[PDB]
A and B are shown apart, each in its own frame.
Chain A
Amino acid sequence: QVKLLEQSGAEVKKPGASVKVSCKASGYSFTSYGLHWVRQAPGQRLEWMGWISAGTGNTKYSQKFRGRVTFTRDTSATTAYMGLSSLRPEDTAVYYCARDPYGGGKSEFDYWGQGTLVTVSSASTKGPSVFPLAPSSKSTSGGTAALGCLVKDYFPEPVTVSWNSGALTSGVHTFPAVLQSSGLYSLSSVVTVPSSSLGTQTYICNVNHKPSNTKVDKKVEPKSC
């Protein structure tokens, strides 16, 4: 509880660098299980990378990563880490830690961490511009209206968008971001709402782009006079 397995944040690393991803165990006895490390490259299948016993510190890994992967666990802090050296563009993927139910190495994985996206690129990190998609220019007639937030020109993924700090969750549509010809990303989030509330309610989108440490809360007010 916090989660059960929880991981570190998304990172952009230059080709040739190294990345260290952690995985903190909470709410079970850390040294009684092994942890596996798995990655998923965009549009690909899951690929097993290695395993670490949290009791002995012993290691097993995929010979695909021979010479450039390391696995470490800090038994006091109940954290395991994977180090991946000599980063190539093709190491852009989501890295998961997942638990071995039995501590032997060869198992199904019953709990997964949430993943951390490592992007390997020489582009600089750029935080987003959030612009309101203001409801109407006096449209109304029917019952529902829609409003949203445009999150323009950031790098790398991901950006997290919440509405009225998490209390408004029904009818939110956060679209997949699109990579523009400049190399930067754009995404929209919208909510469809009873227009009868447009005058009583204040709608705020809460944008978080953790790679640039950007937090923005924007009020979507009607396209008003």
Chain B
Amino acid sequence: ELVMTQSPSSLSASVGDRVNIACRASQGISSALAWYQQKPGKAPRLLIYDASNLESGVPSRFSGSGSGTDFTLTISSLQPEDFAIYYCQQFNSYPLTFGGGTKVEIKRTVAAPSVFIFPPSDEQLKSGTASVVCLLNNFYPREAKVQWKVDNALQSGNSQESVTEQDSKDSTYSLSSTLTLSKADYEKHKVYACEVTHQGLSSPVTKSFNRGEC
């Protein structure tokens, strides 16, 4: 096979910046290069075919160049909706082959999270388990720390996290931490708290509730 190598793997840039992604063919392919855009969790979309032709409906800020072995895709003024993984494919030879991807993430100003905590539902404690969720909504940069404390500093190590991809509108992330304990373990303790540390906050934030609600 003809190997397609992209460079870099990742970039972060601000909006308005010009970005250039390279793709090398391990040997000459003339102009038989296409470029795709894939938003996380979606089918890839054609931007450019024959190294430089824009597909109908693609924004004029996308352009491509190269012939032979070296190709460049340029986004001349990066916009938030350009967050995506970008692939080059050759179609000069069979097997048709893709490059490894260049993820482009958008840089922006820090945004402090909104924090929410949710107790186990009733019908969940009916099945003998209790999931407690802490939500950090809409923040930038992605690095944040969530600490669980049950009966004040008895802070735990039995949670899982999930972070969404960058939003194409405002460039933020959201995150959830789920603490799971058995109905008996939950019915034993009374103060459940989520403590958050992130750059945009002036102090660690805590959202707590008492096992009992009202």
User: Is B137 part of the contact surface with A, judged by Cβ < 8 Å?
Assistant: yes
Contact between chains at A113 and B43 (CB < 8 Å) = yes
- Given A48-B96, A148-B118, A190-B135, are A173 and B91 also a contact pair (CB < 8 Å)? no
Task: Collect the chain A residues with CB atoms within 8 Å of residue B137's CB.
Answer: 146, 173, 190, 192
Candidates A45, A48, A178; contact of B95 at CB < 8 Å: A48
Is B44's CB under 8 angstroms from A106's CB? no
Given A48-B97, A115-B43, A146-B135, check contact A188 B162 (CB 8 Å).
Answer: yes
The reply to whether A108 and B34 form a contact with Cβ atoms under 8 Å apart is yes
What distance in Å separates the Cβ of A220 from its nearest Cβ neighbour in chain B?
Answer: 10
The total of interchain contacts (Cβ-Cβ below 8 angstroms) comes to 120
* Of A45, A115, A148, A173, the contact of B98 (CB 8 Å cutoff): A45
Q: Is B99 positioned at the interface, with any CB of A under 8 Å from its CB?
A: yes
Inter-subunit contact A150/B131 (CB<8 Å): yes
Measured CA separation A188–B34 after assembly (Å): 37
In the complex, which residues of chain B have a beta carbon less than 8 angstroms from the beta carbon of A144?
114
| B139 → A minimal CB distance (Å) | 12
Contact of A34 with B by CB under 8 A? no
Contacts of B44 in A (CB 8 A): 46, 96, 98, 109, 112
Contact with A along B52-73 (1 / 0, CB 8 A): 0001000000000000000000
| B49 touching A108, Cβ below 8 Å | yes
* Contact call B164/A112, Cβ cutoff below 8 A: no
Cβ contacts B156-173/A at 8 Å (1 or 0 each): 000011111000000000
Residue of A nearest to B41 (CB): A176
Residues B69-109 near A (CB distance < 8 A): 87, 89, 91-92, 94-101
**A138→B34 CA distance, assembly (Å):** 55
Q: How distant is B38 from chain A, measured CB to nearest CB, in Å? A: 9
Contact of B45 with A by CB under 8 A: yes
The reply to whether the CB of B143 lies closer than 8 angstroms to some CB of chain A is no
Q: How many angstroms between the C-alpha atoms of A96 and B137 in the bound complex?
A: 33
Query: Given the complex, which residues of A lie within 8 Å of B92, measured CB to CB?
Result: 106
List of A residues within 8 angstroms of B135 by Cβ: 146, 148, 173, 190
Cβ A110 vs Cβ B55 within 8 A: yes
Q: Within 8 Å CB of A146, what residues of B?
A: 114, 116, 135, 137
Among listed A13-21, A58-66, A82-90, interface-contacting one = A58-66
Closest CB-CB distance, B26 to chain A, in whole Å?
Answer: 15
B124 at interface (Cβ–Cβ under 8 A)? yes
With a cutoff of 8 Å between Cβ atoms, the chain A residues found around residue B121 in the complex are: 131-134, 150
- Is B133 engaged at the interface, CB distance under 8 Å to the other chain? yes
The answer to whether B98 and A64 touch across the interface, beta carbons within 8 angstroms, is: no
Interchain CB contact (< 8 A) of A109 among B32, B46, B100, B133: B46
- Contact for A173 among B34, B45, B55, B164, CB less than 8 A: B164
Report the minimum CB–CB distance from B92 to chain A (whole Å). 8
CA distance A152 to B32 in the complex (A): 47
Given the interface contacts A108-B91, A188-B176, does A45 sit within 8 Å of B164 by beta carbon?
A: no
Contacts of A113 in B (CB 8 A): 43
Verify if A169 is at the interface (C-beta below 8 Å from B).
no
Given A146-B137, A152-B131, A178-B160; A223-B95 close (CB under 8 Å)? no
Give chain B interface residues in 107-124, CB to chain A under 8 Å. Answer: 114, 116, 118-121, 123-124
Q: What are the nearest 3 A-B pairs in CB distance? A: A108-B34, A108-B49, A133-B118
**27 sampled A-B residue pairs with Cβ under 8 A:** A45-B100, A45-B101, A46-B87, A106-B91, A108-B89, A109-B44, A113-B43, A114-B43, A131-B123, A132-B121, A133-B121, A133-B133, A146-B135, A148-B135, A152-B131, A173-B137, A174-B164, A176-B163, A178-B161, A180-B160, A186-B131, A186-B160, A188-B133, A190-B116, A190-B135, A192-B137, A225-B214
Q: Which residues of B does A touch, CB under 8 Å? A: 32, 34, 42-46, 49-50, 55, 87, 89, 91-92, 94-101, 114, 116, 118-121, 123-124, 127, 131, 133, 135, 137, 160-164, 174, 176, 178, 209, 213-214
